Enzyme design. Structure first.
Site, PDB file in Angstrom:
ATOM      1  CB  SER A  19      -0.895  -0.186   1.056  1.00 23.72           C
ATOM      2  OG  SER A  19      -2.031   0.845   0.840  1.00 23.72           O
ATOM      3  CG  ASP A  64      -6.862  -2.182  -3.208  1.00 25.77           C
ATOM      4  OD1 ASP A  64      -7.494  -1.657  -2.527  1.00 25.77           O
ATOM      5  OD2 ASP A  64      -5.775  -2.676  -3.199  1.00 25.77           O
ATOM      6  CG  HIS A  98      -5.581  -2.438   0.447  1.00 25.21           C
ATOM      7  ND1 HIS A  98      -5.218  -1.993  -0.708  1.00 25.21           N
ATOM      8  CD2 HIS A  98      -5.088  -1.935   1.318  1.00 25.21           C
ATOM      9  CE1 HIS A  98      -4.214  -0.977  -0.502  1.00 25.21           C
ATOM     10  NE2 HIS A  98      -4.021  -0.923   1.065  1.00 25.21           N
TER      11      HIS A  98
END
EC number: 3.1.1.101
Length: 262
Positions: free
Chosen positions: A132, A178, A209
């Protein structure tokens, strides 16, 4: 002969297993210099010095989210440092600085006779990974440090998706569903912006995610691809050319793209 080739010749089975051939030990970094905290994982008797990989978690996350990479990568012949950031709210540019600092400390430990990894690391051969914002930070590391040998961010997020300057071999893991760092506005525009490098885009079918975090259900495939990519580009190990560059032809993959990867 390739002076960086380590370990036995790979098979799909050996790359899909939960651990590679080497025995893995770990230790907590006593005094982190430039980042929050670190765990170093290292192989015993890899047959030579090995490259080093620094892995950074995402916004609000800690090492637990990316910890599974440590033993997975180290068991195939890498020294791996998983870090906590100074603050869990650090943004990608700060995560990048801390990632490079962690790599610098691994180099220092390699020169420290009291350290378990004394003499085990080839400090000229480094890679970056992260989830991320930590994956955004890895791309920023790569953009700012083209001496890095490979990058493999997962579900990356960055404020700007323009990484056109990147010359580092970069594998992007993406998660199809996601809703945090949506593929169509994060991972894929990032991938599309890089025209100078070997690169690959691997979207996990039905993934959210966290589809590549510790405990995910695709550890066989994701771990195979990560190890193969790092072996192929950090070690220049052409035994991994097919594993690193191939379409896995798998129902776990919803989208596959690659460039400059023979």
């Amino acid at each position: 002969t390739n002076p960086y080739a380590r370990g036995p010749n790979p098979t799909a089975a050996s790359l899909e297993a939960s651990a590679g051939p080497f025995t893995v030990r770990s230790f907590t970094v006593s005094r982190p210099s430039g980042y929050g905290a670190g765990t170093v994982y290292y192989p015993t008797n890899a047959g030579g010095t090995v490259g080093a990989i620094a892995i950074v978690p995402g916004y609000t996350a800690r090492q637990s989210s990316i910890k599974w990479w440590g033993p997975r990568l180290a068991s195939h012949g890498f020294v791996v440092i998983t870090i906590d950031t100074n603050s869990t709210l650090d943004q990608p540019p700060s995560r990048s600085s801390q990632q490079m600092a962690a790599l610098r400390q691994v180099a220092s430990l390699n020169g420290t006779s009291s350290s378990p990894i004394y003499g085990k690391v080839d400090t000229a051969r480094m890679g970056v990974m992260g989830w991320s914002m930590g994956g955004g930070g890895s791309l920023i590391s790569a953009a700012n440090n083209p001496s890095l040998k490979a990058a493999a961010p997962q579900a990356p997020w960055a404020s700007s998706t323009n990484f056109s300057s990147v010359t580092v071999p970069t594998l992007i893991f993406a998660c199809e569903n996601d809703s945090i760092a949506p593929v169509n506005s994060s991972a894929l525009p990032i991938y599309d912006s890089m025209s100078r490098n070997a690169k690959q885009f691997l979207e996990i079918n039905g993934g959210s995610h966290s589809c590549a975090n510790s405990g995910n259900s695709n550890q066989a495939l994701i771990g195979k691809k990560g190890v193969a990519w790092m072996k192929r580009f950090m070690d220049n190990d052409t035994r991994y050319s097919t594993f690193a560059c191939e379409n896995p032809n798998s129902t776990r993959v919803s989208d596959f793209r690659t460039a400059n990867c023979s």
